């Protein structure tokens, strides 16, 4: 009504420069996914969800995700149950946020 409810979504060393201002696009998909894409003429394009307040590093805003934990995934072959075709098989993994 009379004041701006101001929050600080991040405070760090996102490489910015006054000679390369910001140009942004923002979309509303739901009550929690409210994104703001923005680009400099110098640095990588980035994203921020303005309904989230746990942004702790400068790599959380990139188009590509970041992995913090050291995932240890071992694959072993069980025999007796299933239905496969003859040959060799290799498994690949990748995180992705909904």
């Amino acid at each position: 009504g009379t004041y701006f409810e101001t929050l600080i979504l991040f405070s760090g060393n996102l490489n910015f420069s006054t000679d390369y201002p910001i140009e942004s696009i923002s979309v509303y998909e739901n009550n929690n996914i409210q994104k703001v894409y923005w680009v400099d003429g110098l640095n990588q394009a980035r994203v921020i969800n303005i309904t989230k307040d746990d942004y702790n590093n400068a790599d959380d805003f990139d188009f590509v995700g970041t992995i913090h934990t050291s995932s240890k995934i071992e694959v072993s072959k069980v025999n007796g149950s299933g239905a496969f075709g003859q040959g060799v098989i290799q498994y690949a993994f990748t995180y992705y946020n909904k």
Binding site: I25, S26, V27, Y28, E29, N30, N32, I33
Partner: protein, 98 residues
Amino acid sequence: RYDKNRGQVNNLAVSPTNFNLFNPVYSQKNNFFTFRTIDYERFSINYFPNSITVTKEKSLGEDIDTWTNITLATTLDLDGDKGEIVSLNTYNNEIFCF
């Protein structure tokens, strides 16, 4: 088992080519209608402000009302960076969305 060499005293020419023939289909589960558990605390969205469903053309024959049967199979989503679908209206054979 679909062979007729069952319960006969001769059993002289029986063999795995004649005696234990098998039709696997009768060993079928109730696989068509299957379900699974859901997590209450998990956040799966159910709100689509920028989304328009379309039903089937009314047959106007002795069958169901297509309007009441919503399948979400012919959806259409407008741009989310303008805003939610406030109103949909039709004027002179054309739909216009506010």
